[PDB]
Amino acid sequence: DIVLTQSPASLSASVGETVTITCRASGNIHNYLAWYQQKQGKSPQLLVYYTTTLADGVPSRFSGSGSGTQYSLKINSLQPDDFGSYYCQHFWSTPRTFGGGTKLEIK
């Protein structure tokens, strides 16, 4: 199985700051990578799929990039609505797995 490793596990950030989060795969996933945001007490919400495609209604402050085993999520000038946990997930063959998560908290 392909495991996903996310870094950092947690980041403290201020509103308006630009952050980058990473998802590394232990095997080539061929761009089949989705990103989800989860706010406290809610289910996860799709943000990005197939590495760079934003889901409907996700703000353009979000951008995903990557290939091979290295992927990124960049959030430009963070808004309060953006703090919470971020997860990457691959869809390369099966089983599917999720990265461990990145907790984004307000400084």
Binding site: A34, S43, Q45, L46, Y49, P95, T97, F98, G99, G101
Partner: protein, 116 residues
């Protein structure tokens, strides 16, 4: 309006067996996949398995022998059955619809607590 709502037994004692139901509305179980995902308290998401629109299933390697996923197309329900619960089976369980390499709609989750 796509809806997925999960229902489960809440507190159960270890070693019992359990069934969790994912009731869907607004789309056909034959045109999409339904994945099962759990989240232990304070931890990340763990993929448990899925049932494809055609009835094939795939499972997490590590849990494969204790899990079974099935569905009732007629009733619009998907089930997750687990054998001999461990306390570490404590988590929030969600069903999510899959459509072209993405889990686009998720249920609110059901909490399962394995307590003696």
């Amino acid at each position: 309006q796509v809806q997925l709502q999960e229902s489960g037994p809440g507190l159960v004692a270890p070693s019992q067996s359990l069934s969790i139901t994912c009731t869907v509305s607004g789309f056909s179980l034959t045109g999409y996949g339904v994945n099962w995902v759990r989240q232990p308290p304070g931890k990340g998401l763990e993929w448990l398995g899925m049932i494809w629109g055609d009835g094939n299933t795939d499972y997490n390697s590590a849990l494969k022998s204790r899990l079974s996923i099935s569905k009732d197309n007629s009733k619009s329900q998907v089930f997750l059955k687990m054998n001999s619960l461990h306390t570490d089976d404590t988590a929030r369980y969600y069903c999510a619809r899959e459509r072209d390499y993405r889990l686009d709609y998720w249920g609110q989750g059901t909490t399962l607590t394995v307590s003696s």
